[PDB]
């Protein structure tokens, strides 16, 4: 269970952006600050930084 604390608004068309309060499915953690998250709503990819999310 990972919650997006701060909204992530990168400046690239690859990593997706999210808002605060949106849950994200962490795919790979305890490895690189940037993990690959997947949304269960639209069912798409979305790389989210680690300093913007935290286990709840």
């Amino acid at each position: 269970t990972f919650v997006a604390l701060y909204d992530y608004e990168s400046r690239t068309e690859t990593d997706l952006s999210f808002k605060k309060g949106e849950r994200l499915q962490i795919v790979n953690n305890t490895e690189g600050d940037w993990w690959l998250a997947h949304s269960l709503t639209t069912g798409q990819t979305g790389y989210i930084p680690s300093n913007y999310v935290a286990p709840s």
């Binding site: 701060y6 992530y8 608004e9 990168s10 600050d33 940037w34 930084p49 680690s50 300093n51 913007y52």
Partner: peptide, 9 residues
């Protein structure tokens, strides 16, 4: 890939 800058601070 530096981490994203913190919000206004």
């Amino acid at each position: 890939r530096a981490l994203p800058p913190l919000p206004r601070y």
